[model samples]
Every structure is written in C-alpha cells, then in structure tokens.
Target chain A: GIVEQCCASVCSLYQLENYCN
Target chain B: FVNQHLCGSHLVEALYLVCGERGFFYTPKA
Candidate 1:
C-alpha cells in the first residue's frame, strides 16, 4: 500500500530542488 | 515555514537521517 511514497522515498529532495534556486 | 527557512538546507539529508535511523516494525505482543 504505497499511500504516499514521498514520506518514504527521496521525494523530499526533489521538491527541495524545485524551489532551491 | 520557519523550519523550512531555519533549516531549509538540510531538510533532505536531515529528514533522511531521521527516517533511516528508525528501521521500524511491529508484531504480536503476546
């Protein structure tokens, strides 16, 4: 049950990249 | 989002470390 992989996966990094610069 | 401001840089690494330490699990008590 992959409800929200972000909370588990490396999604947090990706989001950071979006608004980093 | 002060935290996102105060500690925005390490959010990824910081978050990863916090999650990586857990390795959490569960089973029958009895």
Candidate 2:
C-alpha cells in the first residue's frame, strides 16, 4: 500500500529524530 | 491539504489503519 509505504518512510524519517536528538 | 504536501503518505497510513482494522482492503496508487 502506498499509504503504508509512505508512512513507513515518514516513520523512518521521524525515527531519525532519535539520531538528531 | 496535508495529503498534498506529504503526497498522500500520511493519509495512506491513517486510511490503512481505519480501513484495514475494519477489514476493508484497499490499494491506493501513486
């Protein structure tokens, strides 16, 4: 699903905040 | 629209949960 894939991408992007912080 | 900036990515996630959790199978195109 595009939505799923898209969210997975965003989650991954947001997940990067962990590294940022 | 939020979907416009995210390219429908966020909607896809929310929709998938609402639709999938309810057992409504859906497939959206890019």
Candidate 3:
C-alpha cells in the first residue's frame, strides 16, 4: 500500500507551478 | 488519518482505480 507521495507534490501545486520549470 | 492530505492527482481520470497502492508500488519497483 502507498504511504507517501512525491516530494514535489508534497510542496503543493501552487508552489510547484510557481517554482517548477 | 492523523494527517489527511487531499486528492490532487488526476491520474485516475482516464482509468479505474482502487486502494492497491500506486506511489508505493512505483517506489518499490524503482
């Protein structure tokens, strides 16, 4: 069973969208 | 759930899913 998700996703979508390139 | 996150991924949008585990499986496989 899954326990943790991605670290990138853990930071939240808004943050990812703003920072990810 | 002590720390409840939310449904944020759209992976199942084009497929049917259950509680078998995706992230865990991928991580284990990787």
Candidate 4:
C-alpha cells in the first residue's frame, strides 16, 4: 500500500520515502 | 538552494487490482 500512500501525498512527496513507507 | 531530493525514479501507476472468480464486481483502471 506504499504506492497507494504515495499517490495520496501530493506536495513534499519522495519516491524512496514513499517506497519505504 | 539549487536542486535536491534525488530519491529515485519517476514511476507512473496507471492501475491496481486483484483478479479472481467470476460473476463478481471488477474494477479496472484504464
């Protein structure tokens, strides 16, 4: 669901962080 | 400040789902 979470975040978003999260 | 945050690549997700049995509801992202 990391990708999903990342998709949720618009501003101040990071690939690595989102991948990790 | 110049450029920064080179975390990784830029991947675009077009769709996401799970396939299974028939006679059910299916959500397709296209």
Q: Which candidate is the best by DockQ?
A: 3
For candidate 4, write residues B1-30 as lDDT tens digits. Answer: 221222113222211111122122212233
What are the per-residue Cα lDDT tens digits for candidate 2 across B1-30? Answer: 123222354554544444454443335545
Deviating ranges (above 4 Å) for candidate 4: A10-21, B1-9, B12-30
TM-score pick, better of 2 and 4: 2
Better of 1 and 2 by TM-score: 2
lDDT of candidate 4 over A1-21, digit per residue (tens): 433333444323232233221
Clashing pairs in 2: A3-B12
Query: Backbone clashes per model, in order?
Result: 0, 1, 0, 0
DockQ per candidate, 2 decimals: 0.05, 0.07, 0.11, 0.09
Pitting candidate 2 against candidate 3, the one with the higher lDDT is 2
Over B1-30, each residue of candidate 3 has an lDDT whose tens digit, in order, gives 122232335322211232223321222113
Best by TM-score: 2
Reference-based lDDT, residue B2, model 4:
24
Point out where model 3 deviates above 4 Å.
A1-9, B1-30
Model 1 reproduces a share of the real contacts of 0.00
TM-score of 4: 0.21
Model 1 chain B is weakest, by summed lDDT over 10 consecutive residues, at B1-10
